[PDB]
Amino acid sequence: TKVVEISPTTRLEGHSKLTLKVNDQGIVERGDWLSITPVRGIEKLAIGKTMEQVPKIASRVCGICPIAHTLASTEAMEASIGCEIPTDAKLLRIILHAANRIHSHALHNILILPDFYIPGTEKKFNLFANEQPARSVMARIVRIREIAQTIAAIAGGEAIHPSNPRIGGMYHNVSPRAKQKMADLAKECLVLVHEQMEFMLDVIRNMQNREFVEVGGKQIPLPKKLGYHNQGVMATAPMYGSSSLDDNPTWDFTRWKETRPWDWYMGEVTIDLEDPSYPIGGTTKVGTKANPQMESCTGVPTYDGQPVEVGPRARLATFKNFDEKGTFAQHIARQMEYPDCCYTILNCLDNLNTSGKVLADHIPQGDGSMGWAANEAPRGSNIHLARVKDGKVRWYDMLVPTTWNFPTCSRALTGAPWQIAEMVVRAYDPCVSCATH
Amino acid sequence: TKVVEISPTTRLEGHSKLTLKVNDQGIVERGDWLSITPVRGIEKLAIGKTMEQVPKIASRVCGICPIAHTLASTEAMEASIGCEIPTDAKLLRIILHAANRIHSHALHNILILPDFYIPGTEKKFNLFANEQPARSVMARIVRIREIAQTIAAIAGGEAIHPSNPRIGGMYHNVSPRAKQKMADLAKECLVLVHEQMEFMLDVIRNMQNREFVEVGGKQIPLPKKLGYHNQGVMATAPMYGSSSLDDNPTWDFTRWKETRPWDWYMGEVTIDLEDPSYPIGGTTKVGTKANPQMESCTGVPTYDGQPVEVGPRARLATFKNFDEKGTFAQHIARQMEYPDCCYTILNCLDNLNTSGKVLADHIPQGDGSMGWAANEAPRGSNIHLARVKDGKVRWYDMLVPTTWNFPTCSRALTGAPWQIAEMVVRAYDPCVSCATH
Amino acid sequence: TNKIKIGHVHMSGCTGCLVSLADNNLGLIKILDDYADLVYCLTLADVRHIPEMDVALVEGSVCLQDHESVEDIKETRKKSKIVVALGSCACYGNITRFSRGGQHNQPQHESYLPIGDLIDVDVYIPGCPPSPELIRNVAVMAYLLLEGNEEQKELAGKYLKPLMDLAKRGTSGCFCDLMYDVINQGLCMGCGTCAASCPVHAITLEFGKPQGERDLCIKCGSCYGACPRSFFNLDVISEFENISEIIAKALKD
Amino acid sequence: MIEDPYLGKYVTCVSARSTDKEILKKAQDGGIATALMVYALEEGFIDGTIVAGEGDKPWQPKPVVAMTREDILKARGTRYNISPQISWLKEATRSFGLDKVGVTGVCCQMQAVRKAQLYPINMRDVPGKVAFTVGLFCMENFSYKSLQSIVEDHANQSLGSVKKMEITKGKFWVYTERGNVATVPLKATHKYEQPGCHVCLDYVSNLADISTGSVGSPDGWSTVFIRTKVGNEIWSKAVADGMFETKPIEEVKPGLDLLRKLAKEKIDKNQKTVEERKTFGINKGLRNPYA
Numbered sequence A, B: 001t002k003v004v005e006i007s008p009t010t011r012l013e014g015h016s017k018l019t020l021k022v023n024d025q026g027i028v029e030r031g032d033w034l035s036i037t038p039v040r041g042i043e044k045l046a047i048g049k050t051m052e053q054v055p056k057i058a059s060r061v062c063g064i065c066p067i068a069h070t071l072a073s074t075e076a077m078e079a080s081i082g083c084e085i086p087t088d089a090k091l092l093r094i095i096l097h098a099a100n101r102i103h104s105h106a107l108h109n110i111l112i113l114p115d116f117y118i119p120g121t122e123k124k125f126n127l128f129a130n131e132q133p134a135r136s137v138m139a140r141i142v143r144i145r146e147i148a149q150t151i152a153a154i155a156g157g158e159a160i161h162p163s164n165p166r167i168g169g170m171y172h173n174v175s176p177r178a179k180q181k182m183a184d185l186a187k188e189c190l191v192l193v194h195e196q197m198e199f200m201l202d203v204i205r206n207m208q209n210r211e212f213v214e215v216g217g218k219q220i221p222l223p224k225k226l227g228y229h230n231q232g233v234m235a236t237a238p239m240y241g242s243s244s245l246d247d248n249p250t251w252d253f254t255r256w257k258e259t260r261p262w263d264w265y266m267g268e269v270t271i272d273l274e275d276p277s278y279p280i281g282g283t284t285k286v287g288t289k290a291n292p293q294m295e296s297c298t299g300v301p302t303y304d305g306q307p308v309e310v311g312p313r314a315r316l317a318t319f320k321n322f323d324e325k326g327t328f329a330q331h332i333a334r335q336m337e338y339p340d341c342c343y344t345i346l347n348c349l350d351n352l353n354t355s356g357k358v359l360a361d362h363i364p365q366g367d368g369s370m371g372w373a374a375n376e377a378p379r380g381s382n383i384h385l386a387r388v389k390d391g392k393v394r395w396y397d398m399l400v401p402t403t404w405n406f407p408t409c410s411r412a413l414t415g416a417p418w419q420i421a422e423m424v425v426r427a428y429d430p431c432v433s434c435a436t437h
Numbered sequence C: 001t002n003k004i005k006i007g008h009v010h011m012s013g014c015t016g017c018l019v020s021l022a023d024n025n026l027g028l029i030k031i032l033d034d035y036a037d038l039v040y041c042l043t044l045a046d047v048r049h050i051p052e053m054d055v056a057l058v059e060g061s062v063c064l065q066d067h068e069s070v071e072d073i074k075e076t077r078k079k080s081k082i083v084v085a086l087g088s089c090a091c092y093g094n095i096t097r098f099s100r101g102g103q104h105n106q107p108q109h110e111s112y113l114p115i116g117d118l119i120d121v122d123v124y125i126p127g128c129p130p131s132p133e134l135i136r137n138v139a140v141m142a143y144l145l146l147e148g149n150e151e152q153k154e155l156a157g158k159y160l161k162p163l164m165d166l167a168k169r170g171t172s173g174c175f176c177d178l179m180y181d182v183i184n185q186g187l188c189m190g191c192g193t194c195a196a197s198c199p200v201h202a203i204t205l206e207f208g209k210p211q212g213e214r215d216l217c218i219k220c221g222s223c224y225g226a227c228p229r230s231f232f233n234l235d236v237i238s239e240f241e242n243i244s245e246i247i248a249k250a251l252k253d
Numbered sequence D: 001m002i003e004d005p006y007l008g009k010y011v012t013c014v015s016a017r018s019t020d021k022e023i024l025k026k027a028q029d030g031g032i033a034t035a036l037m038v039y040a041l042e043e044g045f046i047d048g049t050i051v052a053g054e055g056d057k058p059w060q061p062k063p064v065v066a067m068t069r070e071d072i073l074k075a076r077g078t079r080y081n082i083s084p085q086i087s088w089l090k091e092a093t094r095s096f097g098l099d100k101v102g103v104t105g106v107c108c109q110m111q112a113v114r115k116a117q118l119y120p121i122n123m124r125d126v127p128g129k130v131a132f133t134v135g136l137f138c139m140e141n142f143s144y145k146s147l148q149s150i151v152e153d154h155a156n157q158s159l160g161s162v163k164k165m166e167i168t169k170g171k172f173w174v175y176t177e178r179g180n181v182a183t184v185p186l187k188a189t190h191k192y193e194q195p196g197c198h199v200c201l202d203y204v205s206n207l208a209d210i211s212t213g214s215v216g217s218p219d220g221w222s223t224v225f226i227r228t229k230v231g232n233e234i235w236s237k238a239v240a241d242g243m244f245e246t247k248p249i250e251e252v253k254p255g256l257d258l259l260r261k262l263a264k265e266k267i268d269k270n271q272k273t274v275e276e277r278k279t280f281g282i283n284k285g286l287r288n289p290y291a
């Protein structure tokens, strides 16, 4: 057993690090992936603020997935106070939600491809570079994200930190022209995401057929069960979500308990293995002390007393019984979600009545009852819980998808060459600002 | 094809035997695991007795899991008569239920470790022996079971055959001091079961990486798909259970049909293979006749016309989509249930009101309607069905977890060296007194 | 000429500032192709440590009780010719003004300051989210300021001047900016621009004059920024057609 | 009138404990803070006093204006997290109609009171109606989530079971009602301290009328400083009236030598922290409330 540490991680959102115990062959025996993002404390600063403000602050948790926190937070206030929003507000929120899933998955394509090979070769994708095919692939991705962000701004008021959601519905319905325009963009987008989906699935299939990859000069063997774990999965919807206002909620708050990293992470250790050649700047100097129990910046939520995986594979396993697991399975599941996003948008536009009401006639002020809302954010189940009384937030809690994935990914690190530990991590599409909030 | 028979089995509860047909290499082709425990006939003696007595008799079905039969039987009477019990009685029953799952899983650690290797060596665990590490492991287990049995006696009146449950709730609530004491014990227990859980998971991981094990002198190869079957799983809750009083019961009695061993077990055969060296006393003498269809002491319950697996893997597959199967998967799933037990206890204590009511104000006497209750006992779904009329049991039926597992484990025996057939069996944590009742 | 060297330093931010930049689409790829190298950005590239930079786009604010974070922002000033506070968290604190600690697993992570409170800042790009157009414009103008003829470095230096004046004005942003420095100053003309730019609909105009929902406002500084009576540099803004043509040229294929 | 540079200005210092046995049943130490306010109430030096009463979560303190002997005793025992004692300082002179307000708290809370007396900023009527301050020694404080993490994860105890907490002799001590004891090394707890305690340069509550604490005296006994004329009139009268067992601090172990040493470490450590704020940045520093 030796101790190697990668810090910081790269090609993910936010600031984390990997603290790995390895055997004499350099395979992980027990690795801890933990956040080291400073804790802004959204849930604690929320207390005493108005129910209108708290969702706009929580949105600023993360700029890749602001839709998820705006919606989960707003609908937790609606659930605590017993507010039923109009049908045309729900339709605009679903359009906003699906558009944002398209842009997030596409962004993640940018972050993972540098680890993938142009199929049948030993050249890795470089997207920066003004060469083919990398450059025409970047162009497709850029137009997908652009369509996605435009639809989001139209139905949501803003692509990053949507302004249109409010307690009781939306500020604005959209004009007949706006609806035509979102339809036109989603028609163009459906063709593109099918192309991109097929492209990415082929690249992943080629990776599943490799025996090694190249990391800073060396060949690194590619294990067959790369990134396997036994934690299972948790998901609340294939697309949108669920709240405590529902006749049959698809999440059970009685099965949840958040603990401290204390119960699941490693205690103090000292780094006795180092590699200055790891691209690009090497690992932690030998002799450095590390304590994942105390350096980890997140809490550990559990379901039936155990950490779980959330995200696109969690969703397909829960709702279609998708039966592959691990790193490449996670990549596959995520790409398969591309078309649903655009079919949803088009179905929703078709039912939207641009003359319809978007604000509930009555907004109650709340009596201190607990409500919750789950949003199936691009990376997994995003659950906000709230007690609102007299229009003020008296209690608030956020169980964010990457928070769920931290201890579960850590366990998935067993059996991997420490040089591709980051590849196991990237399959989760991590957002460390989200996880920490 | 030859016929070897192991009788009795050991390191499980109760009296069963294995009747195995093997190929020319000694691999099972078709094995029957069957009960040969005499049938006490609880379900038939129940008829005409009072609804209060029948759960106290049914508890004496099994002394490892008496909580399961007390609760499933009591709640089948409550469901037949339409009695809703007070919230503080439910909380004490859940505390009792989770404590007993802790003691049962720990007991089962004692029974399975003699087949497991101290990791990286060729020494098998001997727990009896006053040597390390076996002895400090036995000490941890002994204190876990002791905590568990103490919590059970406090919330349940008795650790073996709890006295506190009754039709309509409990005889007693507990004092403020009792509640503090259960909290104190569950804090100590959570640390210990995390330690034990990690310890057992490492031992099982080491077993998954072995190619053979040693059985009475010889090397026995360890198949990769050891204990695989295609029967699927059935579970009603991750922790407690479900009854026909529920708005949405999680068990469907329309999908169940119990048949006789006749449809699934082998007919008459004669033992033409023997091994006097099998530890410790050899197998059945050559020339002995056997008839599993007629010697089996249980009925065969089915779900959608087929036997199913129940227990801790059944639960994790149903509720988290846990996606490993077979002997070592079953061991893993069972250990992963340790922490939920203690988190549940602590959550329940926190909501318990020691001044609250434990007896329903009205206990109806019943009109002959059918009710049922499922308890997720340590080994699987325990379902009692009842018709109570004028305070008397007019019809009674028990579908016990090991009863479900008998035909399913039998099928799992294919592809195993007959010398490790017992290891396939022990992964089910069998209770043959339960299965027979 | 050489491309300038640009880095993306991420403090206590949400990565939405980075996303905004990327939402320049092919304009960003044109910039990266012809005018700038991204020497650092943990989100997009594997460079583990802060290299030297001609321009550093710093997003987020600084948590005073995270040692590594105070070090990163000092290191960034040391390693960079131009420091840009990118977005309202970096310029003004924004939602991290509201942080006060007490959350797992670092209850002591309590205090957050905009970067200009710890290091010297040359340019502000205010907004939450900041507009892609502004980030692009500021990046092109930084390149002209460093690799252009004297006619461009003069243009570029006049364009950037109000964004540099904002960095010297202070580190505080709020709806009350419009009261203190506009209405209270005799300067408000009721155009309504502040209402359009506010990202949380905190501003209405009542009888031609701003009305702020101060318990909705997230303290981003956008409204004073966009107000045409905060800064109005007539030398740049009256040449709008020309400066627009130049900018479009610099990105044409 | 001694003038220690680490123990503040004071007349005398003795080691004391209340003679009221009922008060001593749950006092943290010698019962000085409780006994001084009870006696001040019965004698008429105060008509009410702010105390750290029981709150809404276990071991969360809640400030309250106490006006009976019974309400005062409810505040016995040390709570190791923040209790914003001064939030009721002005309200005590309004709706409660008090003429002679008592205040209890740690050192920073005594400073707030003295600042309000000399620079009342929207604190009308407070300067002349503060009548008696009793200050506790305080090395550092914690937030509730910190105290939760220490007690439940590090000590592994249930908060609903804890009868007493004590920092002493390098360890965080938890005592349960059923009789167990658990400890935490103070090195583990250092990440959990409230950051604002790191610039505090006051250990034995220099600005109080009377000061009281644990260090320097045996278990069950308090180290007490009498400082102001108010502190002196009340303490004299109370010893005369039999409210207290005393013992000169010099003839008690560990006594005033240990106390001065821990005070000295606090100021020097925190003074360094105050100094570094000045150069925390590059060409920029952080504010210093003391400049």
Ligand SMILES: Cc1cc2nc3c(=O)[nH]c(=O)nc-3n(C[C@H](O)[C@H](O)[C@H](O)COP(=O)(O)OP(=O)(O)OC[C@H]3O[C@@H](n4cnc5c(N)ncnc54)[C@H](O)[C@@H]3O)c2cc1C
Pocket: D026, D027, D028, D029, D030, D031, D032, D033, D034, D035, D050, D051, D052, D053, D061, D075, D076, D077, D078, D079, D080, D081, D082, D083, D085, D104, D105, D106, D136, D137, D138, D139, D140, D141, D142, D212, D213, D214, D215, D222
């Ligand atoms: C964070 C904190 C840190 C301390 N650190 C030290 C130390 O390092 N060395 C030392 O010798 N003593 C320290 N003390 C004081 C010591 O623990 C005893 O509380 C003190 O001696 C009073 O004991 P007593 O028997 O006279 O009071 P009691 O009769 O038990 O009365 C308790 C008094 O404490 C007040 N009080 C209790 N908790 C709080 C709180 N969070 N905030 C404000 N007021 C409170 C109450 O108003 C009450 O008057 C500390 C106290 C606190 C709250």
Ligand code: NFU
Pocket: A013, A062, A063, A064, A065, A068, A069, A377, A378, A379, A380, A382, A400, A401, A402, A403, A430, A431, A434, A435
């Ligand atoms: N998807 C996503 Fe966020 Ni940047 C995470 N984790 C959250 O809800």
Ligand code: NFU
Pocket: B013, B062, B063, B064, B065, B068, B069, B377, B378, B379, B380, B382, B400, B401, B402, B403, B430, B431, B434, B435
């Ligand atoms: N678990 C268990 Fe028992 Ni001894 C069985 N099978 C029953 O309900």
Ligand code: SF4
Pocket: A060, A061, A063, A160, C012, C013, C014, C015, C016, C017, C059, C060, C086, C087, C088, C089, C090, C094, C095, C127, C128, C129, C130
């Ligand atoms: S300014 Fe807004 S978009 Fe930029 S890091 Fe701060 S919260 Fe995100």
Ligand code: SF4
Pocket: C178, C182, C183, C187, C188, C189, C190, C191, C192, C193, C194, C195, C208, C209, C210, C226, C227, C228, C229
């Ligand atoms: S943008 Fe400026 S001048 Fe125009 S209405 Fe708002 S504060 Fe007044």
Ligand code: SF4
Pocket: C173, C174, C175, C197, C198, C199, C200, C201, C202, C203, C212, C216, C217, C218, C219, C220, C221, C222, C223, C224
């Ligand atoms: S009012 Fe709106 S635009 Fe102005 S500082 Fe507040 S949040 Fe920003």
Ligand code: SF4
Pocket: D106, D107, D108, D109, D138, D139, D140, D141, D194, D196, D197, D198, D200, D201, D202
């Ligand atoms: S250490 Fe100083 S500032 Fe912190 S609580 Fe104690 S008296 Fe107050």
Ligand SMILES: [Fe+3]
Pocket: A043, A299, A397, A398, A399, A400, A437
């Ligand atoms: Fe959270």
Ligand SMILES: [Fe+3]
Pocket: B043, B299, B397, B398, B399, B400, B437
């Ligand atoms: Fe039966």
Ligand SMILES: [Xe]
Pocket: A107, C018, C019, C022, C043
């Ligand atoms: Xe990005």
Ligand SMILES: [Xe]
Pocket: A110, C022, C044
């Ligand atoms: Xe990008």
Ligand SMILES: [Xe]
Pocket: C006, C031, C032, C036, C038, C139
């Ligand atoms: Xe750039």
Ligand SMILES: [Xe]
Pocket: C008, C021, C038, C041
């Ligand atoms: Xe960039």
Ligand SMILES: [Xe]
Pocket: C082, C122, C123, C160, C164
């Ligand atoms: Xe500049």
Ligand SMILES: [Xe]
Pocket: C021, C024, C028, C031, C135, C136, C139
């Ligand atoms: Xe850019």
Ligand SMILES: [Xe]
Pocket: C055, C082, C123, C138, C139, C141, C142, C160
């Ligand atoms: Xe610039």
